[PDB]
Design a protein around this ligand. Structure first.
Ligand code: NA
Ligand code: NA
Lengths: 255, 395, 395, 255
């Protein structure tokens, strides 16, 4: 978490929103994925959301399931994912790194051991996509014991009791997915929630400026990035230039 | 907060994305209300009796047990409309969908049998039925696709990557997460997130309740053991449930051994898998060493599920129920034996339960024992599979 | 001399070679004795209830009749073990064979369904079953051949010349004429020489007896009409029999119209044939102008019989029952309608009865009428036939 | 019938049994069948038993069903059969001619009309193979009204009441198909039955002599003749020479 607190403090001083891209680790392959991630950071990403390839995903779907398939086709293990994470952190000491996980990969070798490994490689937060707040206690406890921020989704069908739980249990940032964003943000501010990142359908600069204007702390963009990766599988170099151009555009919109 | 306990010991729970919790909470409340509603129970009973054909017979098989001290009864869920027990709980879930004011049904299927069950219930009750199916399962079972379409369901082939049951499940849940106000997700076994393991058990428990009444009438005593095949767990928990507090009655669940446990090609996660979190639940599963879900295998498509319902994992853990496995070849021999000696062609799923009962009788033929096997389905669907095998082996 | 009247008016009789008369006389006496034997009736009831699954449901089909003043019930013989009504009377005939001390069963089959019924009854009751089948029918229905062999019957393909049902019948009777001391000929419909039309009716009459009790319980009155398909006549006479003396109840039998009566390709001898002497009986048949038996035709193999049971010819002649026909296309539309609107896949045989009921409702939709259709079998066996037709016509 | 009475009177004067072959009319074709029949008579047949091809036979079976098929393949109608019968009678005024019929062909155009046509063409007897004595009354009555002998089968499972009915109702000859032939013949003589012809498995001269020794009036041979026809379908001339040799042998055995 500390990295998130420091990031949001600096952005607030700059009157700035965060722009946070998502990619799957090892898509389309390890070295290229490391290249992608360094390109995202150099283009202006304020934080990263990184997916660990899973045998059977769900809160994602299409553009991302292919990314998962590509990473499996390259033979990427969770252990190789943790090695990439350590290297990313060794290159980039301050950027917040969040993981998007599914519960079985956290549970598989022991929950406390998973978050211990996150802390060892320098991850800052973990969102377990199929652990609702109702089931989250052992995950949250292990996360906090290893200085990892537990991330929760605030969905469109949220209600007031969910808002209070997400505000009370989340750290680092709140994943915002009906009330107008403004009112949802108001209630999240009233309940002292972690700074909200809007994460639904963020694909153009005007959506980034809109989220910050609504009172969110920034925006998370997932499918859009992985689509650029999808489009240029045969052109590694065009892939990176397109990724640079998109992220630079999205980050500019947050200022 | 929930109204009912989502766990059986350590197993079960609601391991779904946050966006699906309101749908599960709504379903739980509707179910709890329905169980307290005499009019719901009367409508359900009317459908079970006058449409599906309950009660089903309890058949004594004297030819099978000749020369032994075993007495064997078959609970004849094969005689239910549709030819398998699956019909009981889809009628209940379809009524529950209407109780919540829903007019659409979402389902997914692999072997195709649950899809046929959901389609017939949706046709009867006037619900729009859309059914997700892994396209490989599509190709493998084109009869049932035609049956579902005949019955007015929309069948949706899922390409994903692995194009299988798990891929159809994921698409069905993604659909449900955005349509639950108008659509109900008709899960097909006693597994998944709460409240489904509980609902499916309660909508299958007439199997064991009838069995208890029938065996007391015919033998004057309860069985020494009731025996059922376990794919996801619904027909077995339906048989077991009314006997759980009758501690003298053994509960035996039979997982598919496939080509043999030692080959790794089987579908026996309860006894040979490892607890994980998947399908919305904490339960035994088949999975790799670093936590990717493994494929199961069985000659019987209905048992080819790499996990098991959490109530079974719980009953095993406390020793109330015992779980065993039966290989393809043992199930095939039981299938042949029932055809020849009783004139009943059983589902290859149910043949796993029968095979274990045959082993209990044959290994100890002077042991006096009263056994009930749940004959969960009819086996007309399997005669081509059985033919190709016997033909390929020189029979 | 016989104990019972071999004729229904002018129809019926025992037109068999002299050598077969002792077999028919023996069978009649055993049947008359069995009907007076409470222990025989108790054994028969035990098999029907606890093995075959009687009583069968009487299902109200409200979706079908929406917007009309017709109330339609289906008598669910499709829910019987084996999937058709044929099972009732084979269990009775198999018990009758054991009453005469016989240990073998002779049968013959065309569509294969009677052969499956005779094989399952023989397996249950420990009888050696040999089944004659026209080799063309063999090739046309290899699933049922496998079913019969699975169930331990010996299947004997008859090459003759025409290799069909009539050729299998002739070989079965030639066999019987030399083996009747130890073997019983299990005839498959309410036709043939006396006493078979009588025996088959009496071993099918629980269909109408249950229907009467069920409809009085549910509606408080008898049906305006009961409606059944007529191939040889067994499911129809089983439905009709208990209503014959209830003169307010219409009895409607439905013969297959095939491609249309005017095409000559049909199976409607009762209304469009000519009385002849064949199959052991004086009855309407399809025959050429100089007396050679004609081939019938129907999309439904179960109705492809060029004659009809003599009791139907008699009930028609005195006006107690009315007989109509239904074409392939009308039966196909009724098949689709039941699948879509009630979630029941009916036999194409039974679909002819349903089609006529649909016409009675649709032609006069403000006529108040209470109708029962005998749903004589399930239609899983027909989905491939229905598929190929709809595929071949651009559906 | 009268021809049968005259035949048996003459054979009894000669201390002789009758030998009676069976063939299907129009097998393998009309002219050849007429040739076959004239060959059977010239070789020494005392009477004929002639089958009318039927769509669906039974008291016969294999060797004969093929004969029926052959006759159908040649397109032989019952009307063509009656024309052949008239010609046979025109060539052969004294030989008894018996028909083997199935009930539907007798019933088809009216029973009385069928026996009227038999009398017109000069047939002497009719056996309706699927009309047992119990059903025979309208057939017997029509036969006798047209001077046709009704033939009945006395089967191996016969009993005393059947023996008395066959003896009382049959004319011309009794078709004999367990009691030793001798005792069956004794009872048939005691009940004044029409002279018995043994018709089961007659295929060699010693069976003909055996039947006459048992007290039968002669023997009927069916499958054996049609087998000789079967064997030589490709050699019309060998067919006739073999038929001549068999019938001459069988008739010699009856003297
Ligand atoms: Na399983
Ligand atoms: Na018919």
């Amino acid at each position: 978490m500390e990295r998130y607190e420091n990031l949001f403090a600096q952005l607030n001083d700059r009157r700035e929103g965060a722009f946070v891209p998502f990619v799957t680790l090892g898509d389309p392959g390890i070295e290229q994925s490391l290249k992608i991630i360094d390109t995202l950071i150099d283009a202006g990403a304020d934080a990263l959301e990184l997916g660990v390839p899973f045998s059977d995903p769900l809160a994602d779907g299409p553009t991302i399931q292919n990314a998962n398939l590509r990473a499996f086709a390259a033979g990427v293990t969770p252990a190789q994912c943790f090695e990439m994470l350590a290297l990313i952190r060794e290159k980039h000491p301050t950027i917040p790194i969040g993981l998007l996980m599914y519960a079985n990969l956290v549970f598989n070798n022991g929950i406390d051991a998973f978050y211990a490994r996150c802390e060892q490689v320098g991850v800052d937060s973990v969102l377990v996509a199929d652990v609702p707040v109702e089931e989250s206690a052992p995950f949250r406890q292990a996360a906090l014991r290893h200085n990892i921020a537990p991330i929760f989704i605030c969905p469109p069908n949220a209600d007031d009791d969910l808002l209070r739980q997400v505000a009370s249990y989340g750290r680092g940032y709140t994943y915002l997915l009906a009330l107008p964003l403004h009112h949802l943000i108001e209630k999240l501010k009233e309940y002292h929630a972690a700074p909200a990142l809007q994460g639904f359908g963020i694909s153009s600069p005007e959506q980034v400026s809109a989220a910050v204007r609504a009172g969110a702390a920034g925006a998370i963009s997932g499918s859009a990035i992985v689509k650029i990766i999808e489009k240029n599988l045969a052109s590694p170099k065009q892939m990176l230039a397109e990724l640079r151009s998109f992220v630079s555009a999205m980050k500019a919109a947050s200022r | 907060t929930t109204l009912l306990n989502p766990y059986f010991g350590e197993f079960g729970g609601m391991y779904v994305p946050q966006i699906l919790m309101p749908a599960l909470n709504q379903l739980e409340e509707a179910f709890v209300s329905a169980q307290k509603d005499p009019e719901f129970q009367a409508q359900f009973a009317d459908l079970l009796k006058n449409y599906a054909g309950r009660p089903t017979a309890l058949t004594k098989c004297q030819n099978i047990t000749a020369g032994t001290r075993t007495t064997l009864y078959l609970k004849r869920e094969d005689l239910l409309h549709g030819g398998a027990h699956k019909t009981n709980q889809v009628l209940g879930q379809a009524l529950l969908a209407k109780r919540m004011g829903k007019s659409e049904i979402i389902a997914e299927t692999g072997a195709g049998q649950h899809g046929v069950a959901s389609a017939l219930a949706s046709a009867l009750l006037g619900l729009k039925c859309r059914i997700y199916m892994g396209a490989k399962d599509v190709e493998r079972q084109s009869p049932n696709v035609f049956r579902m379409r005949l019955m007015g369901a929309e069948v949706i082939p899922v390409h994903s990557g692995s194009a299988t049951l798990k891929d159809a499940c994921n698409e069905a849940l993604r659909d449900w997460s955005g349509s639950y106000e108008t659509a109900h997700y008709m899960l097909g076994t006693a597994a998944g997130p709460h409240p489904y393991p509980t609902i499916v058990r309660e909508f299958q428990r007439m199997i064991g309740e009838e069995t208890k009444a029938q065996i007391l009438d015919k033998e004057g005593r309860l069985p020494d053991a009731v025996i059922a095949c376990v794919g996801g767990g619904s027909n077995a928990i339906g048989m077991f449930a009314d006997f759980i507090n009758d501690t003298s009655v053994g509960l035996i669940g039979v997982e598919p051994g496939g080509h043999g446990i030692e080959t790794g090609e089987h579908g026996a996660p309860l006894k040979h898998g490892r607890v994980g979190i998947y399908f919305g639940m904490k339960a035994p599963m088949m999975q790799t060493a670093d936590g990717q879900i493994e494929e199961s295998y069985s000659i019987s498509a209905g048992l080819d599920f790499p996990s098991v319902g959490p109530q079974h994992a719980y009953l095993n853990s406390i020793g109330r129920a015992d779980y065993v496995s039966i290989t393809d070849d043992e199930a095939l021999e039981a299938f042949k034996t029932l055809c020849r000696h009783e004139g009943i062609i059983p589902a290859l799923e149910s043949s796993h339960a029968l095979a274990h009962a045959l082993k209990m009788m044959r290994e100890q033929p002077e042991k006096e024992q009263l056994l009930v096997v749940n004959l969960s389905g009819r086996g007309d669907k399997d005669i081509f599979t059985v033919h190709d095998i016997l033909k390929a082996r020189g029979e």
